[PDB]
Amino acid sequence: ALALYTPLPTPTGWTTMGDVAVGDELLGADGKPTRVVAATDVMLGRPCYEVEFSDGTVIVADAAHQWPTSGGIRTSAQLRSGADRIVVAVPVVQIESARRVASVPVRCVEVDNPAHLYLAGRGMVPTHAA
Ligand SMILES: [Cl-]
Structure with a gap:
């Protein structure tokens, strides 16, 4: 689950996790709609x-x-500074840090691609769906 305020790229622009509904298009790890x-x-x-x-x-x-x-x-709680790189399909980004913070409201989505991946955040980082 991601925070409701997380911006997610879509084929037309940007939506928040809070605004996602069944049937909406996000982007898969290949940059294509899902x-x-x-x-x-x-x-x-x-x-x-x-x-x-x-x-x-x-x-x-x-x-x-x-x-x-x-x-x-x-999982977020197991991510390691430097040691971990996000990889799809080609290296995408490196983990700089993962730190426990105050709880905020969150939601999960499931998507229709077999990798169960979608892009999240302003940098469009691949992440796993439920
Ligand atoms: Cl694994």
Whole structure:
């Protein structure tokens, strides 16, 4: 799950996680549109992490949100400064830090591509859907 205020790129522009509904198009890891097949209610009180990438993108996500790295899938709580790079399909960004922060409301989406990936944050960082 990602914070409601997380900007997500779409084929036409930018939406927030809070504004995502079933049937909306996000972008998959290949930069092409992918359809939202499910989207949770707002979830409150989840432990959250602030994940900062080498491109300047900062995403707040719950502790168990999953990220594709070159060494494996890692949750936000397991991400390591420097040691971890986001990799798809080609290196995308490096993890600079992941730190526990105050809880904010979050939501999960599921998307219709088999990799279960979509782009998130102003830098369009690949991340795993539920
Ligand atoms: Cl893995």
